[PDB]
Every structure is written in C-alpha cells, then in structure tokens.
Design an enzyme around this catalytic site. Structure first.
Site, PDB file in Angstrom:
ATOM      1  N   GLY A  59       0.807  -1.271  -0.081  1.00 34.24           N
ATOM      2  CA  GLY A  59      -0.018  -0.048  -0.167  1.00 34.24           C
ATOM      3  C   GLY A  59       0.815   1.202  -0.138  1.00 34.24           C
ATOM      4  O   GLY A  59       1.911   1.410   0.533  1.00 34.24           O
ATOM      5  N   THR A  60       0.246   2.482  -0.562  1.00 35.62           N
ATOM      6  CA  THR A  60       1.049   3.402  -0.924  1.00 35.62           C
ATOM      7  C   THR A  60       0.296   4.876  -0.481  1.00 35.62           C
ATOM      8  O   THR A  60       0.860   5.931  -0.644  1.00 35.62           O
ATOM      9  CB  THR A  60       1.707   3.547  -2.324  1.00 35.62           C
ATOM     10  OG1 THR A  60       0.590   3.815  -3.121  1.00 35.62           O
ATOM     11  CG2 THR A  60       2.380   2.487  -2.821  1.00 35.62           C
ATOM     12  N   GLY A  99      -2.428   8.902   3.966  1.00 36.47           N
ATOM     13  CA  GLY A  99      -3.610   9.430   4.774  1.00 36.47           C
ATOM     14  C   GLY A  99      -3.540  10.702   4.987  1.00 36.47           C
ATOM     15  O   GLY A  99      -2.619  11.547   4.339  1.00 36.47           O
ATOM     16  N   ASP A 120       0.153  -1.139  -4.960  1.00 33.78           N
ATOM     17  CA  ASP A 120      -1.001  -0.385  -5.192  1.00 33.78           C
ATOM     18  C   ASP A 120      -0.939   1.004  -4.994  1.00 33.78           C
ATOM     19  O   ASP A 120      -0.561   1.347  -3.735  1.00 33.78           O
ATOM     20  CB  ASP A 120      -2.215  -1.072  -4.139  1.00 33.78           C
ATOM     21  CG  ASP A 120      -3.483  -0.373  -4.273  1.00 33.78           C
ATOM     22  OD1 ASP A 120      -4.330  -1.002  -5.092  1.00 33.78           O
ATOM     23  OD2 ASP A 120      -3.966   0.444  -3.537  1.00 33.78           O
ATOM     24  N   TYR A 127      -3.112   9.412  -4.347  1.00 36.53           N
ATOM     25  CA  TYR A 127      -2.144   9.188  -3.115  1.00 36.53           C
ATOM     26  C   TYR A 127      -0.886  10.079  -3.273  1.00 36.53           C
ATOM     27  O   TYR A 127      -0.151  10.043  -2.353  1.00 36.53           O
ATOM     28  CB  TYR A 127      -1.776   7.616  -3.075  1.00 36.53           C
ATOM     29  CG  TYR A 127      -2.992   6.926  -2.887  1.00 36.53           C
ATOM     30  CD1 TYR A 127      -4.047   7.116  -2.579  1.00 36.53           C
ATOM     31  CD2 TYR A 127      -2.656   5.404  -3.320  1.00 36.53           C
ATOM     32  CE1 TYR A 127      -5.208   6.263  -2.251  1.00 36.53           C
ATOM     33  CE2 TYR A 127      -3.575   4.427  -3.012  1.00 36.53           C
ATOM     34  CZ  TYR A 127      -4.911   4.915  -2.681  1.00 36.53           C
ATOM     35  OH  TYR A 127      -5.824   3.886  -2.363  1.00 36.53           O
ATOM     36  N   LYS A 178      -5.572   4.223 -10.164  1.00 39.21           N
ATOM     37  CA  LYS A 178      -6.854   4.658  -9.776  1.00 39.21           C
ATOM     38  C   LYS A 178      -7.203   6.056 -10.189  1.00 39.21           C
ATOM     39  O   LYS A 178      -6.407   6.856 -10.099  1.00 39.21           O
ATOM     40  CB  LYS A 178      -7.237   4.218  -8.259  1.00 39.21           C
ATOM     41  CG  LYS A 178      -6.859   2.965  -7.754  1.00 39.21           C
ATOM     42  CD  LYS A 178      -6.974   2.932  -6.260  1.00 39.21           C
ATOM     43  CE  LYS A 178      -6.469   1.825  -5.600  1.00 39.21           C
ATOM     44  NZ  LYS A 178      -6.271   1.749  -4.156  1.00 39.21           N
ATOM     45  N   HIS A 215     -11.882   4.395  -8.678  1.00 39.89           N
ATOM     46  CA  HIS A 215     -11.528   4.517  -7.196  1.00 39.89           C
ATOM     47  C   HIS A 215     -12.879   4.707  -6.281  1.00 39.89           C
ATOM     48  O   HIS A 215     -12.905   4.072  -5.226  1.00 39.89           O
ATOM     49  CB  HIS A 215     -10.588   5.879  -7.038  1.00 39.89           C
ATOM     50  CG  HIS A 215      -9.936   5.951  -5.974  1.00 39.89           C
ATOM     51  ND1 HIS A 215      -8.679   6.361  -5.604  1.00 39.89           N
ATOM     52  CD2 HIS A 215     -10.091   5.263  -4.545  1.00 39.89           C
ATOM     53  CE1 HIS A 215      -8.111   6.045  -4.649  1.00 39.89           C
ATOM     54  NE2 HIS A 215      -8.743   5.297  -3.880  1.00 39.89           N
ATOM     55  N   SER A 231     -13.622  -0.086  -7.181  1.00 39.72           N
ATOM     56  CA  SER A 231     -13.367   0.111  -5.898  1.00 39.72           C
ATOM     57  C   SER A 231     -14.543   0.905  -5.060  1.00 39.72           C
ATOM     58  O   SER A 231     -15.192   1.643  -5.559  1.00 39.72           O
ATOM     59  CB  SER A 231     -12.188   0.891  -5.521  1.00 39.72           C
ATOM     60  OG  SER A 231     -11.574   1.078  -4.179  1.00 39.72           O
ATOM     61  N   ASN A 232     -14.726   0.270  -3.959  1.00 44.41           N
ATOM     62  CA  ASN A 232     -15.991   0.669  -3.130  1.00 44.41           C
ATOM     63  C   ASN A 232     -17.195   0.563  -3.740  1.00 44.41           C
ATOM     64  O   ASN A 232     -18.090   1.560  -3.463  1.00 44.41           O
ATOM     65  CB  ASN A 232     -15.768   1.950  -2.596  1.00 44.41           C
ATOM     66  CG  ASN A 232     -14.437   2.324  -1.813  1.00 44.41           C
ATOM     67  OD1 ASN A 232     -14.240   1.637  -0.606  1.00 44.41           O
ATOM     68  ND2 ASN A 232     -13.779   3.154  -2.409  1.00 44.41           N
ATOM     69  N   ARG A 277       7.583  -4.626   9.638  1.00 44.58           N
ATOM     70  CA  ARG A 277       6.264  -4.875   9.246  1.00 44.58           C
ATOM     71  C   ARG A 277       6.021  -5.410   8.001  1.00 44.58           C
ATOM     72  O   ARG A 277       5.420  -6.266   7.668  1.00 44.58           O
ATOM     73  CB  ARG A 277       5.387  -3.672   9.434  1.00 44.58           C
ATOM     74  CG  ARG A 277       5.273  -3.677  10.988  1.00 44.58           C
ATOM     75  CD  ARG A 277       4.864  -2.100  11.517  1.00 44.58           C
ATOM     76  NE  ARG A 277       4.624  -2.082  12.867  1.00 44.58           N
ATOM     77  CZ  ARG A 277       4.714  -0.656  13.360  1.00 44.58           C
ATOM     78  NH1 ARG A 277       4.818   0.508  12.650  1.00 44.58           N
ATOM     79  NH2 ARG A 277       4.350  -0.606  14.767  1.00 44.58           N
ATOM     80  N   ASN A 306       4.330  -8.893   7.325  1.00 41.74           N
ATOM     81  CA  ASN A 306       2.879  -8.958   6.492  1.00 41.74           C
ATOM     82  C   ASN A 306       3.097  -9.893   5.667  1.00 41.74           C
ATOM     83  O   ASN A 306       2.230 -10.702   5.158  1.00 41.74           O
ATOM     84  CB  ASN A 306       2.779  -7.856   6.017  1.00 41.74           C
ATOM     85  CG  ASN A 306       2.364  -6.810   7.063  1.00 41.74           C
ATOM     86  OD1 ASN A 306       2.142  -7.089   8.258  1.00 41.74           O
ATOM     87  ND2 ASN A 306       2.161  -5.632   6.599  1.00 41.74           N
TER      88      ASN A 306
END
Ligand code: CA
Length: 324
Positions: free
Chosen positions: A21-22, A25, A53, A58, A87, A120, A158-159, A263, A267
């Site tokens: 993941g990239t 936030g 991703d 982002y 996306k 997205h 997505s979503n 991590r 993972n």
C-alpha cells in the site's frame, strides 16, 4: 526471501495475494513519511513483493515510478514481474476522461501500462464538490476503452456495493477484475465478498487491520487481544499475521500499508499456515459491521456506496491536490 502466492483474475492474469500500500492518509495530506514509504518499497521488492497499489489521489505516483525504475535498473526485477495498480478519481468520470487520467498516471509512474486500473469510487464529483450525476456505467465505458488501447492489462472497481456490482455486471461488456473494498475482522462484508467471488471478481481488501492497529471507542480486537494472541501462539504467528492469513484464507487479496521494513517482512510471512475450523469460527465472531473508512462528506452524492446515517462540506484535500 518471501513467497507471495497469486490469485487468478477473470481475464487470464494473476494478481499477488498481498500488495504494498502507498496511501499515507489525510491526518491535511501527510507527506512526512514519503521517504520511509519509498525505502520500505525498495526493501519490499528486494524480499519478494511484486504487487504495488497506488492511485492518482495518493500523490506519490512519480516517486513510486522512480523506485520501480531503480529496481529494474538494479536487476532485482523486470517490469513483467511487477503487478502495479493505479486508480481514477471522482472528477474524471466522463468516459473520455478515464484515458486522460490514466495516461497522466502512467506518465507519472514512467510506464507503458499498468496491470490494473480502478474506478476509485462510484461517485462522480467535480473538483468544486458538484455532483455530476454521471452513471458509473458511462465511466466504465471509458475503462473498457483504455483496456482496448493497451493502457492497462485489467480494469476493476473500488468501493462498489453489492447493488452497484450487480448492475455493473449486468450491463458491462468486460467485467471488472476486482472490487477493492474495506475488509477486516470487524467488517467482513460477507455477502459482498460472496457475491463477488460467485461472479469471479477478486476481492481486494484495504484497511485489512481495521482499527486494530494504534493509528478510540473502537471495537475489539486490539493488538493485546487474548484470543488473537492465543491463535497466534498456536500457529506461531503474530496478531497482525493471523489477521492477514485469515483474509488470505477467505481468498481475499490484502493491501496493508506500512513504512516499516520489519512490518513489511512480517506481513508477507503468512502463507505457510491453515487456520482450523475452531479458529476461523473465533475470528468470525469479531464481525460487527464497524466500518473504519466512512467518508461522511460523500453521503449526499449519488452512488455513495455505504448505508447513510441521517442528519449530518468536502474538505479540499479530497478534491484538489498536486503530485510529486
Ligand atoms: Ca510498462
């Protein structure tokens, strides 16, 4: 070093079951951790991650593309070994705009093509917050067009909720390859997952740890949860690994986000254990409908996917930004 298995998509291609993941936030977009994201990416690729991703939203596509080019120059990978996703955001939902958005993303990333491009979100929203009320079916024609042009090897969403998935699948010419959504121990999305998998759409989970990881009255499990720890000791794994392995065992691709190399390593060490019926039943008890990612500012828009909370302005960082 790590060996990530692959799921098969409904278009003939493989997708690695774990992706890097990239998204950093909106805490307001926080750029401070970029260098660490990039350095942990380089490490991820050195140990054996191939799935990356990212998204226009982002902000970091130019930097991810530099890292990719570096690893290719080092001889660590060939382009062909990597699975790279980007996306298209809410202001590019006209059919012709999908090509403009994706070509730009492809320029940022330094690529001929991506392996996967997603819608997205199902909403069509201007940069000023106007609901453009474009049907996601119109948008999807543009995804089908960029596929035919070789700009991507796969198209997905997505979503999308189960209703949106059904209507998309009933009307499309090329079905989506994936539906990328939140899945974690508190939000199982069992019906949505089952529906996708029955229609051969691969489910890809973002926020796979939900609120378990420190980053307030949020539900169990927390990292100090005795049942998670106990399942841990039983198979010789940490709590986060139990969580990822459970998703893997549901046939769900995970996209954890971390900028810490230990991590990253932890993972990916999740594919050598089978959770038994008892521990699957325990982990299933955490499911309670608590949704970690619920952007309330989008409720009033057409095609907002989640259940609406009655009785509640889109922040600028969700609408207008620069990249690099
Ligand atoms: Ca390429």
């Amino acid at each position: 070093k790590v060996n990530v298995p692959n799921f098969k998509l409904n278009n003939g291609d493989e997708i690695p079951a774990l992706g890097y993941g990239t998204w950093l936030g909106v805490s307001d977009f926080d750029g401070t951790d970029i260098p660490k994201l990039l350095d942990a990416l380089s490490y991820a690729i050195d140990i054996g991650y191939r799935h990356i991703d990212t998204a226009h939203f982002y902000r970091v596509e130019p930097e991810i593309g530099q890292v990719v080019q570096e690893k290719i120059n080092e001889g660590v990978v060939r382009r062909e070994d990597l699975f790279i996703t980007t996306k298209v955001w809410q202001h590019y939902h006209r059919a012709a705009d999908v090509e403009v958005s994706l070509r730009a993303s492809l320029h940022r990333l330094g690529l001929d093509h991506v392996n996967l491009v997603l819608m997205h979100w199902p909403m069509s929203i201007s940069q000023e917050g106007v609901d453009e009320k474009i049907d996601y079916l119109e948008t999807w024609r543009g995804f089908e067009e960029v596929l035919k042009k070789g700009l991507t090897k796969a198209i997905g969403v997505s979503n999308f909720n189960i209703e949106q998935m059904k209507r998309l699948l009933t009307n499309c010419n090329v079905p989506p390859a994936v539906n990328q959504i939140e899945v974690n121990l508190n939000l199982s999305q069992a019906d949505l997952v089952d529906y996708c998998q029955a229609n051969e759409v691969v489910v890809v989970a973002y926020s796979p740890f939900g609120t378990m990881v420190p980053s307030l009255n949020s539900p169990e499990p927390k990292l100090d949860n005795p049942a998670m720890l106990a399942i841990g000791r039983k198979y010789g794994k940490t709590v986060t690994q139990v969580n990822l392995g459970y998703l893997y065992q549901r046939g769900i691709v995970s996209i954890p986000k971390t900028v810490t190399k230990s991590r990253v390593l932890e993972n990916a060490s999740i594919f050598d254990f089978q959770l038994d019926d008892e521990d699957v039943a325990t982990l299933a008890q955490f499911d309670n409908g608590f949704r970690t990612v619920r952007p309330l500012f989008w409720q009033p828009y057409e095609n907002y996917p989640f259940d609406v909370v009655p009785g509640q302005d889109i922040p600028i960082a969700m609408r207008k930004w620069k990249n690099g």
